Amino acid sequence: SDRVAQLTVGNSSITTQEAANIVLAYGEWPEYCPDTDATAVDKPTRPDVSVNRFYTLDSKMWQENSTGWYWKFPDVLNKTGVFGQNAQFHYLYRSGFCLHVQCNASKFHQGALLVAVIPEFVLAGRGSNTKPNEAPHPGFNTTFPGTAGASFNDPYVLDSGVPLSQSLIYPHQWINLRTNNCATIIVPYINAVPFDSAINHSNFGLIVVPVSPLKYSSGATTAIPITVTIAPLNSEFGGLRQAVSQ
Amino acid sequence: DPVEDIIHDALSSTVRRAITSGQDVNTAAGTAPSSHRLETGRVPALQAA
């Protein structure tokens, strides 16, 4: 009665049989920018069916010695669908997201994933150089991975200095292969400005860390993939001009 | 009365109304929504410096 669940957005739907809950980040739904908070004078555009739907990224294979992955939003949806085109043609972007991560496994596999969102997930350069002119900084592809998504190098510190233990203060959810098989999170627009660019600043990042490593006996299925799907909700765009990829 | 070109202007040279009244503006001006208007004869863009 509470394990089964169906989400539906636009022309897409998602079923699930073992996930039990919907984590609403910070207890607020995605809403449109009210007039008392808007700064842009122009009229934005609100498709609400061309962009508000479930885009399914590629799958990442969970290995016995994996280290975790991260995505940036709305970086992933900048080349796919009408969302990608609107974000490439418009300067001001605003939207909440609905994340849904699936990693199914038999009742004999064991493991646990931590699926969290990090508002303003600033990455860090791993290096002991203390002068700001020779210090290492993460490359562009390492900080804005894109639809492919990037992997961690040392997830215990989330590649951002902060420990992973306290990362549970963020809107998070576990994928425990004994109880649930997918985790979902509805996150609103989290930013210090009414609108913002969609190709320069990524509002937040998604984190999938295999805390309890995958373990199974011989003969079971070795290829355990993880699939993420994202639905931008209550999206607005403004400031139309020629297409700028980045 | 005997000569009235001198009274007609004396009682006409009072404070001439030069209305340019200002208003107390506390904050910057907002904006009102506007749709598209396909009309002829009413052009707010054409000015004359």
Q: Please list the residues that pair with A151 across neighbouring strands.
A: A69
Q: Are A177 and A15 in contact (CB under 8 A)?
A: no
Q: What DSSP assignment string belongs to A164-224?
A: SGGGGGSSEEEEETTT-SEEEEEE----SSSSB-SSS---EEEEEEEEEEEE--TTS---E
CA-closest candidate to residue A100, choices A128, A135, A71: A71
Q: Are A216 and A109 in contact (CB under 8 A)?
A: yes
Q: Resolution of this entry in Å?
A: 3.5
How many Cβ atoms from other residues are within 10 Å of residue A210's Cβ?
A: 23
CATH classification code of A1-246:
2.60.120.20
Name B19's Cβ contacts closer than 8 Å, sequence gap at least 6.
none
Q: According to the entry, how was the structure determined? A: cryo-EM
Decide if A45 contacts A211 (C-beta within 8 A).
no
Residues A7, A246: Cα–Cα separation, whole Å = 32
- Other Cβ atoms closer than 10 A to A170: 18
Task: Centre a 10 Å sphere on the Cβ of residue A107 and count the other Cβ atoms it contains.
Answer: 7
Q: How far apart are CA A157 and CA A155, in angstroms?
A: 5
Q: What residue ranges do the domains of chain A occupy? A: 1-246
- CA A120 and chain centroid, separation: 12
C-alpha–C-alpha distance, residues A197 and A90, integer Å: 8
DSSP A240: E
- List the alpha helices (DSSP H) in B1-49: 5-10
